[PDB]
Structures are given as C-alpha cells and as structure tokens.
Design a protein around this ligand. Sequence first.
Ligand SMILES: Nc1ncnc2c1ncn2[C@@H]1O[C@H](COP(=O)(O)OP(=O)(O)NP(=O)(O)O)[C@@H](O)[C@H]1O
Ligand SMILES: [Mg+2]
Length: 846
Amino acid sequence: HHHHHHGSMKPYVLKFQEIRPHSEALVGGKGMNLGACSNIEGVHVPAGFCLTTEAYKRTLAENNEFTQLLQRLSSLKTSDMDAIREISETIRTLIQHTQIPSEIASYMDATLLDVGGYEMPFAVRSSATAEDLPHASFAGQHDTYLNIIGKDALLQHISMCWASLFTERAIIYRIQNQFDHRKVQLAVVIQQMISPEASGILFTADPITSNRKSLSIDASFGLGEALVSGLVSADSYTVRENTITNKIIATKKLAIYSLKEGGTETRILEKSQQTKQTLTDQQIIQLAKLGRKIEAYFGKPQDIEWCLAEGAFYIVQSRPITTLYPIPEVNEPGNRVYISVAHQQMMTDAMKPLGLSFYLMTTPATMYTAGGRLFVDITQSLSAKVSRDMMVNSLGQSDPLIKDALLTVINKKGFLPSIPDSSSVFELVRNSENSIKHLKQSIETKSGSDLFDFIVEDLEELKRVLFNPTSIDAIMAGMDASAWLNEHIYQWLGEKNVADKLSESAPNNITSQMYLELLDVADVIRPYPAVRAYLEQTKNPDFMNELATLEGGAETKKALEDYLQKYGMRCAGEIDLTKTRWIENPLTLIPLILSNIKNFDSSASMHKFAQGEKEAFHKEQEILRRLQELPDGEQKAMETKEKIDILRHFIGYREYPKYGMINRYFIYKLALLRAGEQLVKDGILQEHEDIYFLYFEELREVVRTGQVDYELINARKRDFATFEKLTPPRILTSDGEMINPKDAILGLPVSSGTVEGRARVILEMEKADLEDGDILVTAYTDPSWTPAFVSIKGLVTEVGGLMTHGAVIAREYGLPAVVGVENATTIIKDGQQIRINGTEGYIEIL
Ligand SMILES: Nc1ncnc2c1ncn2[C@@H]1O[C@H](COP(=O)(O)OP(=O)(O)NP(=O)(O)O)[C@@H](O)[C@H]1O
Ligand SMILES: [Mg+2]
C-alpha cells in the first residue's frame, strides 16, 4: 500500500475509543469492556488506553530465561507448595528487572500525553486474557495500582502488574481451572484517576434471588480499592423500579484517599461520619438509572464499579453477571410462574439437547427449556381459584416441598393476578412387552435416513401402547384411591398418610421389584471376600470379564448379567436419553451393590417384602376394626375396603409406563449411536457422541444431507458446561426469580440457609488451621482466601457489603452467611460454636 504496509501489524497501545471488536485477545476482559463502555451515550468513563498484550509478548514471553521457567512451572501441581512459592518469587523478580523496550515505552509517552500527561495521576489496572477462551474470567486474580504519577513510576507498575500474573494465588488458580500458563497474557489498562467522594459496586439484578427487576448497590466513602480491599464496610441500597426499597446503613469507619504526590492513604473517620448515608436518595436513584442504561446497551445484567466526584457518576468498569439461572423465552405477556419438572422428576442435572428433544417429543404438554432443564408454565392454573387450590392441593401431597415455594408466590400480591377392569393391568403390561420385542427386531435392519424416519413412527406407537386412556385410567385409579384413603382416614381416625403403610409390598411395582433383585446380587457377593475387595477397587469399565478369574465371585457375573437384562437400561437420570446406562457402564452400579452389603443383612429381599405385607395387612385390619366402632361404622369400614383393594391393585402399575418408556429410549439410543458411529466413518462427525448436542430434527437432516455446523455444536457444549454449574429452582419466575429475637445479633443477610459448628479464626490464613464441620468468622475477607474454604458450612464477618468477597463466594458455595456484624470477632468468644441463618441476618449462641 498506500499505508506503507504499516499495515497488518498488532499495535502496542489502544485508546478506549480505538478498541475494536472481539480484540479481547489484545486488551483482555476488563479492557474490551472499558472500550465498549466508553462508546455508550450519557455515560462518563474516564479516559485511558490499554497496554496491549503485544507489549507483554514482546517484552516477556520472548525471553528465553522466562520460557525456561514457565516450563519448569508447568511441571508442578498444587500439592507442591514450596516449589510454587520459590518459583514464583523467582519468576516475579525476573519481571521487575526486565526493562521495557524503548520502542514501546515511547508509544506510551505519546498516548499518555493525550490523556495527559506525566504530571497527572493514573490508574494501572491489569486486564488479562486466556487464548481461545474469551469467556474466562480472572476476577480478583491480579494486582492493580491507584494514583501512579510519573513515567519512571508508570513503568515500574506496568511491570508489577505482569508480575501479579505469577503470584501463588494466581498460579494455583490456573492449575485448578487447567488454564495453561504461557497461554495467559496481560494487558495493562492505564486510566485517569478520579478522586471520588464515594465509590462502590452495583448489580442490575439482585444478588440473592436474581430478581432482574431490582437493582442493588454497595456504597462507601473514598476510593474503591478499600471496599474490594476487605475492610471497610459499606452501605447497601436496593432499588425496585424507581423506588428505593431498603436502606442498610453501615458503620464505615475507614476511607481511602489520594495523595497529591502519588499513592494512597487510609483515614479513620470521625464518628459522626461513620453512620452517614453515603449516597443521598436522589443520587441512589440517579445512579440506578445509569446501571439500567448500561444493562440495556449490553443486553444482559451487568456488574459495575462506579465513582462519585462532585455530583458526577463515573463508570470505571463493567462486566456481565455469570451466576444467573436463565429464563425461558415464553412469548406470553405478564407475570408468569414456571415450575421445575426437574425437581418433580428428581433429576435437576442439566440435560443435553438430544435428551431434551425426546422428553419433549413424547409428552403433549407444553414445556419450556431454561438452563438445560425443563419447566412447566402454570400461570393460568393460578388465576381461577377453583383451580389454584385445585392445584396447590395436588402438589401439597407429592412434591410437598414444591408447594411451599409455590405458596410464597401466591401471596407476593404485587405479582398476580370410573376404572378399567382387572384384566387391564395385565393386558397393558403384556402389549408393552410385545411392542418392545418388535421394536427390538425391527430396528436392527433399519439405517440411514430411514432409521430416523423409523423412530418418528415409533414415538406414536410408544404413546399408543404406553399412554392409552385405559393405561391412564389405571394409573389414576390407584393414585385417586390414595387421596381418598388419606383424608377420609384423617377425618375419622385422625391418622395422616395412612396410604403409605397400606401400600407396602404391593404387587407389580416395577421399580420396587428391581430394588429387591439388586439386594440378591449383593447377597451373592457376601460369601466371597475376594470379589467385594475387587469391585471396591476397580475403576475398569470391563471389570466384568475379569470376574471369572476369581471364583470368590464369578457367580457374581451370572448374577449381574441376569439383572442387567431386566434392568440394565436404567440409570440415575434415565429421562435424558443421552445419559449413560447401567448396562452401558456397569461400573455405575457397583456403589449400590456395595452400599447394600454395608447396610443390609443377607436375605432382606425375603424379609423386607414379607414384613411389608404383614404390616400393611395388620394396618388394614387395625383401621377397619377401629372404624366400625363409630357412627355409620359398618358403612365407612365397608367404604374403605374397596378403596384399599383399588389401591393395591393399581398402585404398582403407577411405575410401569416410565419403565416402558425409557426401555424404548434405550433401543433408540443405540440405533441412534450406530448412525453416529457411521457418520464418523463417513467423515462428517469428529466423535460419535457429538450428537448429544443436536436436537432431533437438527440431527435428522444431517443424515439426509451430510452437513453440520460445529459452532452451533460448540456453543451448545460451551453452554451445557455453563449449566451444570447451575442449580434450578423449584419455581422460576418470568422475572428470573428463584423460589426455594433469641438474644440475637443483627447483621446483613447476604446468603440463605442455617448451619452450626465451630469458632473464629483471626486468622493467620497464611498459617491457618481449619477443620471440618465449622462456621468461619474473620473481619476482612478478600479473594486471597477464595481457594481455601470448601470445608466451611457458614460464614460471618465483621466487614459488610453484600457484594463483598465473603458474600459472592459464600453465595456460590451455597453456605448461609451473614456479614456486617458489629464486633463478631470479639463478642463470639473463644472459638466455640454458634447457629447462623442467612435468609434473615442473625447469629446466636449455642
Ligand atoms: N481511574 C480510577 N479512578 C478511581 N478509582 C478507580 C479507577 N480505576 C479503578 N478504580 C477503583 O479502584 C479499584 C481498582 O481495582 P480493580 O482491579 O480495577 O478492580 P478489582 O476488583 O480490585 N480487580 P478485578 O476483579 O480484576 O476488577 C476498584 O475499586 C475501582 O472501583
Ligand atoms: Mg474491579
């Protein structure tokens, strides 16, 4: 060219106004956001630029002594603490003694005089990146410096940032997340200092409850680094719509202010000062409005660092929130309530797409996907009361826990507004059996696009042989018999849930049959301490063909085979066709077999059954005998006995169709895996199990026309990954909402629950001794301990703010935790014990 070939080159420095798109690979997370954050309208971002990773690659990843070391480090694992300490020290000093090329240090001078210049104070903040992984975060992993003035001192701190990438805490963090050193770079953000009166964090969701329609703020006096620092406390405001709706005022006894000549000092605050409302209600709203605008520009809930300097609000960071369980896209207006069928089905593992397709294509009810799990919209049932109660009463009986969640929805106020005959069961089960035998024979000849065209046929046959109106009547005949028997025997004899005792050892229960038989398997293994020792050890998926080697077992094998012919097609999570079955990987069955042996006596199929009967039959006559001791006596007892006979006749079939169903699933799954196997051979698919991420139709027209789209597939995996980390509610809300005095020390709730245990740790975290089954109490908490505390059941800290470290991490690990307590380190003497709860903010003595 005509640009002097000047011209296909990576730059060294980029202004927030220059930063291009998806150059995250140049300026990293914090930077790419700062950039985009500038280009917003009505938002004041300070100015600055980024030291591009080129500067890091050229200065430090192109040093032989450097690379030699990083190689020496790629050797270690977390178990090796000292080597890490040492190598870290060494690597770290090499960086603070590796000067920056005069070339680069001159670009900086050039830009930095535009922002400008070397007499003004700057912020040196480190934004990092992981190659070919733009959705990785280093939140709170590296250093940052406030108020750096001067060239000599700017270069000193750019180097201390790069160094902050090699701290044990940072290193160890990459080991655990398997990010690779040498694959992580650092951009450095050089930004104008703001001397603010007040600074803090803001979330455009609620941290607890993911409301999405309520914004929460954390504010304090002074510079922000203090709040993120761990001590001082903060002020917490919550804003819904344009109304302030909570104000927790804290005791901010510290603040951090700039020095005229660089650096930062910490001031105690005059007592009158420490209880002041650090924003004024006009500013709280004026601020919330901002957070809302930003969120609108990005299209997702954001995490924001802000500054208050002479009225004015400056945005100095933005981020997305990563911890939100998503919301189904239901195109139906108003406030809606979704109920998790995950929790009903007792699964609440994420489900891959192929599996989700199948659950969907067999029910005719209308369900939604969110977060990789399934939900049912139940909003209309809740309108008409004749049906509301008609609902909550049904759940109230099964899924009782689901109901409680439901009821809290019911009064948020602001939110809303015959019996087939005895030949039946038999016939029903037979034809399911026979249907499954044709299906078996029929699919092994099918292939290609036929095979798909095939199982579309069968999904109707399935619905037809498994969900007749005879079958359903049969299912309901048993269940309705329980309802009747439970309340009517409440109202006459005053004994609840009698239907459970009357149901015991009832015939034809397909699942209950299964568990008995796996008791016998266990029973075969007890005579032979050889086997049980083996099974206990083996992590071999074919441990099975290594069974006849030892005769101590080896009968063990003919046992397992018989059991795996009648049940190998089930697994915890059967409803996802994609999940691995028992007959597929027999190792997944071992632990039960083992746990039966530990916890049951031999021959317990024999006894537990019998004592099931005898007790359901002596509870049958205890009822009836007691009934005819009252008015209309003979007619009530007469009345119930038909009901019991209905109960035991149908109750076991309740369980059959799901078995009939996943039985066909498994047959599909296998023919569906031949197709995949074939596709790989043909060259279209990398792995044969790379179909679990296509829905049925998506898949079906890949075997018709052999074309696939792999960053569909890869986003699918990337996302299935993101949702496994997530734990579905019993009730999800159109607004993202997640549903389900005693000499007391008040605090900030922060994180929901209740636990009990141990004492305070001062704590020399550096030389810290912890212990299982215990609550924690320091006063300062910061990321330094993030990678240290799994063992905890609950947290309590002096410092406050619900978006402190204590909060956000206790909220992910699922611990209940209260912060902001007055003098917890003191006032909870001698590391003793305690009971805390976090749905409200209190703490007490046991
Ligand atoms: N130019 C600036 N002027 C004033 N305060 C600033 C400026 N830049 C950053 N801050 C604040 O000073 C601190 C800078 O630390 P920073 O590393 O950027 O955030 P962090 O939480 O400590 N680490 P990270 O999780 O990577 O963002 C935060 O409290 C910011 O709110
Ligand atoms: Mg930050």
